[PDB]
Amino acid sequence: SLDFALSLLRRNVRQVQTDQGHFTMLGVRDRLAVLPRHSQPGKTIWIEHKLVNILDAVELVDEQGVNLELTLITLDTNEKFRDITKFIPENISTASDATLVINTEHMPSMFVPVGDVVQYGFLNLSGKPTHRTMMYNFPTKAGQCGGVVTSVGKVIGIHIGGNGRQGFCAGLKRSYFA
Numbered sequence: 001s002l003d004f005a006l007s008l009l010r011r012n013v014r015q016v017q018t019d020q021g022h023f024t025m026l027g028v029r030d031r032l033a034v035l036p037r038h039s040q041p042g043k044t045i046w047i048e049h050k051l052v053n054i055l056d057a058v059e060l061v062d063e064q065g066v067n068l069e070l071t072l073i074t075l076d077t078n079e080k081f082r083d084i085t086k087f088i089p090e091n092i093s094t095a096s097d098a099t100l101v102i103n104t105e106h107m108p109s110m111f112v113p114v115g116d117v118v119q120y121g122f123l124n125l126s127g128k129p130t131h132r133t134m135m136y137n138f139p140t141k142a143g144q145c146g147g148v149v150t151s152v153g154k155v156i157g158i159h160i161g162g163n164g165r166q167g168f169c170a171g172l173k174r175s176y177f178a
C-alpha cells in the first residue's frame, strides 16, 4: 500500500508552480492532469523547473453549477502519464487510514497519515461554496494543496483546504476523466 503511494509518487504526482504558488499535480492519463481550482493554471504552468503550455483547462462544477474545486488541464508535451483512472473509484468514496501524498518543491515526496476520510459534502472554502468534499481530522498546512488522498490502492481525493485542525479534499470519481 505504501507501495502504491510510491508508484504514484514516482510516475504520476509532480511538483508544479503557478502564479499562485507551489502545488502538487496529479497526472491521470495521457496529457491530462488535475489541480486545485484555486491554483489558477492559466495558459501555462511550471512542471518541475520547466514551462509547459496548457492546451485546455476545465473548472469542474456540479449539476447545480456549484464549484467542485478541481480543474482539468491538458498539457502540451511528448510525455504521457501512466493511466491511473482504474485506481480512481466510480463513486466518491470514504476510507480509513488514508495517506496524503504531497510532492511540492518545498515539500517533496511527503507522506502524511491523514487517517480516516469521511463524507462532508458542502464546505465554505474561503468565500467559495464547494460541494462533494471529504474531511479528515489532521492539521494540514499551507503548501500541501493538490496532494493526493490515497488508501488501499485507491486515489480518492485531492487536498484543497484546512482550518488548522482538520483537512478537506475534493472527492475524485472516474467519470470526471473521460
Ligand SMILES: */C(=C/C(=O)OCC)[C@H](C[C@@H]1CCNC1=O)NC(=O)[C@H](Cc1ccccc1)NC(=O)CCC1CC1
Residues within 6 Å of the ligand: 020, 021, 022, 038, 124, 125, 126, 128, 139, 140, 141, 142, 143, 144, 145, 146, 160, 161, 162, 163, 164, 167
Ligand atoms: C493548500 C494550498 C496553499 O498553499 O494555499 C494557497 C497558496 C492550502 C492548505 C490549507 C491552508 C492552510 N491549511 C491547509 O491545509 N489551502 C488553502 O490555502 C486554501 C485556500 C483557498 C483559497 C481559495 C479557494 C480555496 C481555498 N484553504 C482554505 O480555503 C482553508 C480555509 C477554510 C477551511 C476551508
